[PDB]
Amino acid sequence: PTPQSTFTGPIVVDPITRIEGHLRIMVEVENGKVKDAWSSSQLFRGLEIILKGRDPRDAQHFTQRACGCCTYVHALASSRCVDDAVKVSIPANARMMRNLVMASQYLHDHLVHFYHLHALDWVDVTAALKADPNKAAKLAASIAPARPGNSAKALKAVQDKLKAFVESGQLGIFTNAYFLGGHKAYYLPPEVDLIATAHYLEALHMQVKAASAMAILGGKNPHTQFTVVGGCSNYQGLTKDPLANYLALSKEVCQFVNECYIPDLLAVAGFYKDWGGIGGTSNYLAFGEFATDDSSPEKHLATSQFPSGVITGRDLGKVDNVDLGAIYEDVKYSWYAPGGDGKHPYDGVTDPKYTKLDDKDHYSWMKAPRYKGKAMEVGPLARTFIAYAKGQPDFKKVVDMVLGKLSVPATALHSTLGRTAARGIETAIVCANMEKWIKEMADSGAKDNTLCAKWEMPEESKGVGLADAPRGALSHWIRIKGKKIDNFQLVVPSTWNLGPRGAQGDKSPVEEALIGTPIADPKRPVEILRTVHAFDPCIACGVH
Template sequence: MSTRITIDPVTRIEGHLRIDCELAGGRVSKAWASGQMWRGMEVILKGRDPREAWLYTQRICGVCTTVHAIASVRAVENALNMEIPLNAQYIRNIMIAAHAIQDHIVHFYHLSALDWIDVPAALKANPAKSASFAQGISSWHLNSVQELAQTQEKLKKLADSGQFGIFTNGYWGHPAMKLSPEVNLLACTHYLQALEVQRRANMIIAILGAKTPHIQNLAVGGVANPLNNDSPSALSMERLYYVKTLIDELGDFIDNVYLPDVCAIGAFYSDWTEHGAGVTNYLSVPEYPLDSKGTAFDLPGGYIPNGNLAQYRPITGFHDQFFSRGVNESIKHSWYAGDWDRSPWEEETEPHYTDFQEGGKYSWVKAPTFNGAPAQVGPLANVLCLYAAGHAPTRKQTDKALSMIGSLAGKSMGIGALQSTIGRHAARAVRAAVLYETLRKQWQLLIENIGTGDLATFIPPEFPKGEISGVGIHEAPRGVLSHWVVIEDMKIKNYQAVVPSTWNSSPRNAKDQPGPYEASLLGTPVAVADKPLEVLRTIHSFDPCLACAIHMVDRKNREIVRVRAL
């Protein structure tokens, strides 16, 4: 006899996601992922000047703002076959690398760690034992007995007040929780420290982008940052060297806190390397361009079918048709009019809501495919593709993480262990470590290029008459992001955004194949049906961003919500 559970909404994500599962024999036998609000950005952009599209698209999400701006300007530049100044590439690269690091830190500590740590159990910990464990795996200067005792005191005050604040409503005491009180205390301490560290990454973006979220310095053709050491209103060496200080602070936290924490939790929950693989076709795109044409990159991209790294095929650049010809989207199970499976350039966006139908339409999310099959995107796909491509920093950080997990768990860990729920967290931490190295490199390249006397940051775009089309790709924190634009006589004729959470949270496609969320849940053990912590663990491991996948708009221009700043 099966049991039906519905989690609606899934919290600690961006947007509105509903997960339905059928349980049989204490395990998930069927699953449905449903996006519960509509994204109408495609309709808003029709008829607008393509140079302004990035200002609108970064409003798709309140978290992933920078990434949509980058993908949007790249789409228009791709349509125009533009080259942009090297300084613009490096400034963009620094911003998006800092954004990705900030996103990864926030995701682990503030959006998903509470699935693995039992906060009230930390009240029983011995701070001295906790500090001893912490100092055995890292040299972080804030792993002292005093710091841990202060965190424990803060937790006690929250508990005694009856208001557990940000830690309210967790599945505390759940049978799937297995960390010792001391490790729980360490994780809670780093949770609070990460709040300050992630702010340092945002400071980098704000310095270069004028503000964050919703940067203001992008332009089709480059960036709006003037380079001038003699002007306090320009981007000067003084500001760039302060950016370097912030970069180094991020690296210290990643190397000595984030990566060791993920490895420790991965070791204690090593049984979770057996759950959550789901779709094992992995898609990633090249990122951090090193030339003005978008043909050379610091991080390669590619495609791995069926989890077989030996079959890795590279995606070489912004103009590689292996990617642009491989992507289609289906609406067979999505709340749009019709039943088609098309390239994003040929899509229509006509909403048609029919209520939740298990065998019919049940989500606002479309179903992307690559070469006719679903694909998983995200840090796991990115790390596996980089590893398969022989990218030296990725191999170094991946091997380091697997060695640390294996040492703590007392068993050997191969790269295949990453294809799992807990493996997605490990891959995200590995990617953060790689991105720190990338961030340092991009900063140095910018400094050296300015030193040659090159101060160019922008080339004005020129639009031809007639119709042109382009696709802008970006390896965003949650995975492959692509914006597809058709331009006619300098006006947007069609615009589509195929975002990471569209790939991962997709409903069944035209062939009725489940999307990555749905496939990853199959076989997952659920100890307590009305407390489905195990389901949340796997879903949160993808870092869902449903606002990106299906952004809401009122077509009658009525006020939806008013926010008051106090």
């Protein structure tokens, strides 16, 4: 059975570590299971306030600093939003370049999330010291493609490095880890812990390569600097040598995704099959990404190769089109002035008003985004269900592979296990498309190196920029007046997932997902971390 204590009482986890930004989770636990939950975002910066009166061309540079983990994505959303507002259609080369940079970002972001943020909830690193490296190599040989990184010699080297570190008595980032001394919620054999730890270390090197690929096109990582109103600035990114280097680095990263990430994910999933019944939600939203036509937000929604859509009540038989007019944000349970509920983002208001820590009437700096009154999960699981439901052939193939390998029905994907698996699934699919996308741009660029369109700043206008960032549906909404920013509103995927209750007192996706969480050890509540981390929280993104 799933380990579960008899604990009744409150648990607070602050800080939630291994996320971006500052999150406090409060839960009530009864008889070892979470019965109620609150997601409390603990920092406000106020980028929307800062943007007022500024030059719309400047927006992307400020909004990019909403977050440095999903770097790029806000510069892309702001550029799309100003493009819409000035009514410019970007050249084909700029659509391709912008989308490739997004692809590169998905690869970096997901790899770092699984290994460096999430894996320590499932992998007991100190237990890796008990493994037989000969047995580990044998196991690695059966569960993953042959590679020298998985040899007994390579795994013994990792184990010896780890042993020297632990023996030093300075445990650094592992100090007071929930797994020290063993923990009933940690299920893996030591051999699997060793394999995963070896890959965690390799991933530290691989993410450098992923960022370098991204920088060939983006100028630098973090915080790219190649987008402009009407397209991109990076003419060098259309040329032969840079693109050859981009392809070579992307192939190395993809090889790691296919050799290490997916096989580790499946191995971990196989031991934690009980997590297929914990942490589910019901409604999913995506704006889509990787569109063949980015001339308008309508065309983006319609032509996204990772498709857009809305699923309600787990009903994969009915994927609805996204109604942008139906999005609004509530503030009833947030640290903003009363009066601000039910605002569509073109009418959005950001009037901060703090009360006190743990006030059940106002407990978060995130707004509560809702869709005709319903909370919506966004991100890899949303995209996966939507794509699977629409019969997108890559998602159909990869999802069925995972379901087959785990021997679980698709309904088991509505869970924390599924949310974790979906992040891997879509990483494999981005990898599968990289070469096609690169060759397409290489050819388009050889043809005609037009990269930026002509445009004129209007006196008064409005516009929306949509994107599906690594964590989900992202939108930036601008009102221009007197050729300046009159309003600028971000509604960000972590706002959808990790925001507080809406005006009707209805829990957000993370708050719902946490209901029913078993707690084996209330002193070391790893199960809370498992579900929270599965959403890949980004609090700087969510609050801005």
